[PDB]
Design a protein around this ligand. Structure first.
Ligand SMILES: C[N+](C)(C)C
Ligand SMILES: [Cl-]
Ligand SMILES: [Zn+2]
Ligand SMILES: [Zn+2]
Ligand SMILES: [Zn+2]
Length: 270
């Protein structure tokens, strides 16, 4: 049977989607990875109407963006997971099949040398400078309720200008001073490579983004399919994902091969 895997447009989405495809294919499915749908909302819409059967979402995204729930006073990872799992099920029959084992958080990043000069270590240190800085969003952060609107509300500042670009372009854009602040993805080692500095989210504005495989309700009836997805439960930690991402973004290796190498190493395929 046919299984189409969605993806948002960045490294680990391609890698994980392919990882899932290989495991499904090893268990009798014809799996494909669909690319270029767009972001969170379009992937979730696609999942609901069965254009895709499953994709890799993050808890904090599902909570704030998809379910449009209100930030608690404190972010608690397992609480957000529990509420996402219940809310997706209650709303659309969407099933959280598996936790992959890693967070890929939004984290605000600046150039390290600028941060060092200005004594900027945490997001509230940006307040002094924010109305002079250019923000380089990925396609979603600028407009998402847990993105800049959350930075605005919790820290009380907006940036001078907001540019949007594909996720992968953020890192060079800030390195080359086209922008000054980016919502870096914490599974992307180009933060270190390009000499950027993640700022502490000292007021806890941003939620946890635990990577989860979500499946639409009709597909989740397939228990064998579900059980294949669960082979990945907790199997991919942040350093593993960062390493696999590096292989994609810096080594320019194919997403399927990166996935296959990982699965072979882990004894998940022989
Ligand atoms: C994956 N992102 C970053 C939320
Ligand atoms: Cl996301
Ligand atoms: Zn000012
Ligand atoms: Zn590890
Ligand atoms: Zn072998």
């Amino acid at each position: 049977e046919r299984v189409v895997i969605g993806s948002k447009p960045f490294n680990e989405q391609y890698i994980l989607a392919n990882m899932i495809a290989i495991l499904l294919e090893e268990n009798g499915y014809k799996a494909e990875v669909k690319e270029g749908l767009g972001g969170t909302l379009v992937n979730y819409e696609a999942l609901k109407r069965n254009d895709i059967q499953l994709y890799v979402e993050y808890t904090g995204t599902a909570y704030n963006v998809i379910l449009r729930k209100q930030p608690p006073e404190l972010w608690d990872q397992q609480y957000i997971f529990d509420e996402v799992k219940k809310g997706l099920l209650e709303a659309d029959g969407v099933v959280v099949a598996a936790k992959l084992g890693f967070r890929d958080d939004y984290a605000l990043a600046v150039r390290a040398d600028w941060a060092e000069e200005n004594g900027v270590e945490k997001i509230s240190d940006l307040a002094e400078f924010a109305d002079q800085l250019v923000f380089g969003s990925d396609p979603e952060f600028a407009s998402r309720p847990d993105g800049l609107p959350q930075i605005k509300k919790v820290y009380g500042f907006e940036f001078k200008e907001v540019k949007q670009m594909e996720p992968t372009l953020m890192y060079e854009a800030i390195k080359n001073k086209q922008v000054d602040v980016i919502p870096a993805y914490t599974t992307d080692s180009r933060v270190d490579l390009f000499n950027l500095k993640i700022l502490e989210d000292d007021k806890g504005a941003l939620p946890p983004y635990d990577a989860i495989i979500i499946v639409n309700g009709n597909t989740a009836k397939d228990e064998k399919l579900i059980s294949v997805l669960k082979l990945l439960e907790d199997r991919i930690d942040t350093d593993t994902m960062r390493a696999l991402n590096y292989q994609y973004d810096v080594e320019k290796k194919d997403a399927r091969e990166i996935a296959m190498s990982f699965l072979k190493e882990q004894g998940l395929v022989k």
